[PDB]
Amino acid sequence: QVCTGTDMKLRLPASPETHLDMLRHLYQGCQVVQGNLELTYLPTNASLSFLQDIQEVQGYVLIAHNQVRQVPLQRLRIVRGTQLFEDNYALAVLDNGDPASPGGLRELQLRSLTEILKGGVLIQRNPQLCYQDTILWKDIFHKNNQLALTLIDTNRSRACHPCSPMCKGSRCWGESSEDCQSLTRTVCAGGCARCKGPLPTDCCHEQCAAGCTGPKHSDCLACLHFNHSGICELHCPALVTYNTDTFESMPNPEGRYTFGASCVTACPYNYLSTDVGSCTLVCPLHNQEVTAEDGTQRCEKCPCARVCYGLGMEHLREVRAVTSANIQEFAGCKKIFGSLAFLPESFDGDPASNTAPLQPEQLQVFETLEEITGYLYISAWPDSLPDLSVFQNLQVIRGRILHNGAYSLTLQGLGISWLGLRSLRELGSGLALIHHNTHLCFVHTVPWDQLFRNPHQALLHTANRPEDECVGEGLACHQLCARGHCWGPGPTQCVNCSQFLRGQECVE
């Protein structure tokens, strides 16, 4: 039902051939996307039926470089704009069309889109796309949307039928009567932000987003603010309430944490239950996470300890890689509050600053690491290291921060023959992708279901050592391994032991 979004922008996928699986696993059956929704570089005949469910995007929606003729986000209603494309646009459709039939997105058919809270719209360089000029974008933009700006590229290369004859004002996202625009703001009596029609009787409860089916807080089709068990309120009920006479704090049985635009009993697995009554991925300043017995984590106020940070956080916020210059900052860590990334640059070095290449002996810094808050991205690696022994003691990747916003773990272009991640027990989020590691095997030897914690997790893989070639060398899990399942060759690599261990080897 709820899944996170992505942060790829216009970056090409590392493995385009796995792109549809990436998207299917991340979004199939997801109605609400935390963060941004991005579809970039899809093929003409791509199958995106799994995205028919999305109703809401917290951030921006980007459709770009897609030759996909149809992108059926027909249930999308609300784009919140909490983060914007180019820091300004809630919606962007870019580069759709070729330079017997041509590819390129033809129409958007967003029959459901009625609200943009923040951010503008960009529909540019899309020679095969029509009806981007047939929307009353100012109605969609919310009353409090200061960037109610739409830029349309009308230099089209395709002849199109005018909007369905059934569209009011000829306002549509397409040629069908089902592709016509609904109006929720600029048609509202009394100047109310949202309504379901032209009468004062049609004004929606203030707490409603994108319209309503009636004036009650239970009639909102979506909340502007928060959904408390179907009830829209301007805030979630205080997690801790106050005494009638003294106003002293006391637990609120009706108290909830704010999650997205919903109120929850407790924050979802791998989210932080902040003491203030909110759900985060990252604790507020001067609050540390505390792990709960139920798999949730909570943020409580500290006088804080020194904390290990990874990429995308703090002073490493603008740093996209682990290098020989910053590898030492992970010394002594059990957990990293951020991501790790090993790029060819990490291992090639960078003469611009006379920085030495990262050496394999420096990767030992992660041997004490049990948990990664963000993602682990390895697109380079010493070939002197046949496995990932470096992370053999890694137990958990929370993946709150994903690579390109999609992967909690990606490995590509390595000389490793097996992974060997003996201690890995959990993947909190995102997908994993392994590719173009033609020496690598022990891919199908670890049911990945044992590490996954939610319905949107999957392993994507390609261009690894062919399974047939690997087993042809006699490479298989030791018969002593529980279920014959392992991370690599040898009894030392068993996912579990049927008998007992000798050190890490399963023995009898």
Swiss-Prot record:
The modification Phosphothreonine is found at residue 150. It comes from Homo sapiens. It is linked to Glioma: Gliomas are benign or malignant central nervous system neoplasms derived from glial cells. They comprise astrocytomas and glioblastoma multiforme that are derived from astrocytes, oligodendrogliomas derived from oligodendrocytes and ependymomas derived from ependymocytes. Ovarian cancer: The term ovarian cancer defines malignancies originating from ovarian tissue. Although many histologic types of ovarian tumors have been described, epithelial ovarian carcinoma is the most common form. Ovarian cancers are often asymptomatic and the recognized signs and symptoms, even of late-stage disease, are vague. Consequently, most patients are diagnosed with advanced disease. Expressed in a variety of tumor tissues including primary breast tumors and tumors from small bowel, esophagus, kidney and mouth. Belongs to the protein kinase superfamily. Tyr protein kinase family. EGF receptor subfamily. It comes from the Eukaryota. It is found in: Cell membrane; Cell projection, Ruffle membrane. Autophosphorylated. Autophosphorylation occurs in trans, i.e. one subunit of the dimeric receptor phosphorylates tyrosine residues on the other subunit. Ligand-binding increases phosphorylation on tyrosine residues. Dephosphorylated by PTPN12. Protein tyrosine kinase that is part of several cell surface receptor complexes, but that apparently needs a coreceptor for ligand binding. Essential component of a neuregulin-receptor complex, although neuregulins do not interact with it alone. GP30 is a potential ligand for this receptor. Regulates outgrowth and stabilization of peripheral microtubules (MTs). Upon ERBB2 activation, the MEMO1-RHOA-DIAPH1 signaling pathway elicits the phosphorylation and thus the inhibition of GSK3B at cell membrane. Homodimer. Heterodimer with EGFR, ERBB3 and ERBB4. Part of a complex with EGFR and either PIK3C2A or PIK3C2B. Interacts with PLXNB1. Interacts with MUC1; the interaction is enhanced by heregulin (HRG). Interacts with KPNB1, RANBP2, EEA1, CRM1 and CLTC. Interacts with PTK6. Interacts with RPA194 and ACTB. Interacts with PRKCABP, SRC and MYOC. Residues 1-508 are extracellular. Glycans are attached at residues 45, 155, 227, 496. This is Receptor tyrosine-protein kinase erbB-2. Disulfide bonds join 3-30, 130-160, 163-172, 167-180, 188-195, 192-203, 204-212, 208-220, 223-232, 236-263, 267-279, 283-299, 302-304, 308-333, 441-470, 477-486, 481-494, 497-506.
